[PDB]
Ligand binder design. Structure first.
Ligand SMILES: *[C@@H]1O[C@H](CO)[C@@H](O)[C@H](O)[C@H]1NC(C)=O
Ligand SMILES: *[C@@H]1O[C@H](CO)[C@@H](O)[C@H](O)[C@H]1NC(C)=O
Ligand SMILES: *[C@H]1O[C@H](CO)[C@@H](O)[C@H](O)[C@H]1NC(C)=O
Lengths: 181, 198
């Protein structure tokens, strides 16, 4: 759209799992969002928050506004629902992998709709607890969505990881496999 | 000293199991000190209405958003406040965000590895940089290398760092000095690292 840089408040509201979110984006990377339970602005990078604040209420407000709007449009559309677009999923390291050397596995989930997911990591079969983090349901240009699931690990010699992912656009819970050479 | 925002507009007519989504985007686009604003409203993937500063008013992207257009455009106070945004909200945030956003600089880490037997490759693994604008170049004994090179697409880690892999085609001779070279808005002097085979 002939621009140098792009800053957008994107926020959605839906009737399922994520009751809806509200955030800010600067060139496709997410800056801060508003945690709706905790009623606070959460800054993606530590230095962001220590640089400037943002009124948590403003996002709360807009979320309420959009809750409303949802219902209006539930009307003038005889309750129409789009069909579920399956996720394209890749998994890759954050740093170059090497022998017993602290690293992070990234699980990028793309091109899906709606944003309702169950995502878990499996390490040699086992479900991982510690080491797991994750992005918000990020909104896309094309009104599809994508997410990042993060896992920290040490590159063991023989040792595999699968990124287990459930979404309505599937029925096979899809796992992308991953390992070193 | 704080990020400004914009209340959304109420829709018209307010007065796997089921699922409905409603999205709203408020996008600022900056060019040469210029600023153009775009407020769109999506129901379930279908963008139905929208405001473009460059148009000056709303357009019904699908018949689904016809009721909003008619109402909103016969509302002088609404219009006048949309038009203001390029200068109110957009300017404020763009200017406020600057140092941490526009002036963000992250030194990439560079790394060179084999990967061979059983073709023959040499990955130059460049991790952890912002912004994503980067140049990566190969040299054999000083001299550039076009043929045999594959750049992965730029890959967003989504924690405000990018990653990239540029592998080269291999034919190791004897005293070969193979240099990977990177350039980025952060480091002024172009960082390089190399490889031999003995
Ligand atoms: C929407 O409403 C109209 C009422 O005239 C009706 O013809 C139609 O069956 C409804 N659509 C659906 C998908 O139920
Ligand atoms: C998520 O997990 C729960 C487990 O009870 C299941 O009922 C639900 O269908 C799952 N959702 C998706 C989108 O796979
Ligand atoms: C932005 O700079 C361009 C040169 O690329 C020039 O045409 C113009 O003076 C500037 N834009 C506006 C809207 O004045």
């Amino acid at each position: 759209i002939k621009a140098d840089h792009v800053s957008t408040y994107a926020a959605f509201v839906q009737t399922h799992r994520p009751t809806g979110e509200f955030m800010f984006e600067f060139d496709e990377d997410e800056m801060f969002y508003v945690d709706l339970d905790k009623k606070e602005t959460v800054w993606h990078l530590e230095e962001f928050g220590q640089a400037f604040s943002f009124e948590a209420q403003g996002g709360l407000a807009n979320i309420a506004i959009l809750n409303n709007n949802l219902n209006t449009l539930i009307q003038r559309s005889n309750h129409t629902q789009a069909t579920n677009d399956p996720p394209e999923v890749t998994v890759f390291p954050k740093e170059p992998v090497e022998l017993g050397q602290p690293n992070t596995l990234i699980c990028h989930i793309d091109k899906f709709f709606p944003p309702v997911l169950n995502v878990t990591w499996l390490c040699n079969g086992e479900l991982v607890t510690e080491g797991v983090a994750e992005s918000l349901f990020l909104p896309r240009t094309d009104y599809s969505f994508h997410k990042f699931h993060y896992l920290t690990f040490v590159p063991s010699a023989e040792d595999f990881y699968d990124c287990r992912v459930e979404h309505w656009g599937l029925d096979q819970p899809l796992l992308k496999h991953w390992e070193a050479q | 000293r704080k990020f400004h925002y914009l209340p959304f507009l109420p829709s018209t007519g307010g007065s796997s199991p089921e699922n409905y989504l409603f999205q709203g985007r408020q996008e600022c686009y900056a060019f040469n000190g210029t600023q153009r604003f775009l407020e769109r409203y999506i129901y379930n993937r279908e963008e139905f209405v929208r405001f473009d500063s460059d148009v000056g008013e709303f357009r019904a992207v699908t018949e689904l958003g016809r009721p909003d257009e008619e109402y909103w455009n016969s509302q002088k106070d609404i219009l006048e406040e949309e038009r203001a945004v390029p200068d109110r909200m957009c300017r404020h945030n763009y200017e406020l965000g600057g140092p941490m956003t526009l002036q963000r600089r992250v030194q990439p880490r560079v790394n060179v590895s084999p990967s061979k037997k059983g073709h023959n490759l040499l990955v130059c693994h460049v991790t952890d940089f912002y912004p994503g604008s980067i140049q990566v170049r190969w040299f054999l004994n000083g001299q550039e290398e076009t043929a045999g090179v594959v750049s992965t697409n730029l890959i967003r880690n989504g924690d405000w760092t990018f990653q990239i892999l540029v592998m080269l085609e291999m034919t190791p001779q004897q005293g070969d000095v193979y240099t990977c070279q990177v350039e980025h808005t952060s480091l002024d002097s172009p960082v390089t690292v190399e490889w031999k085979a003995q």
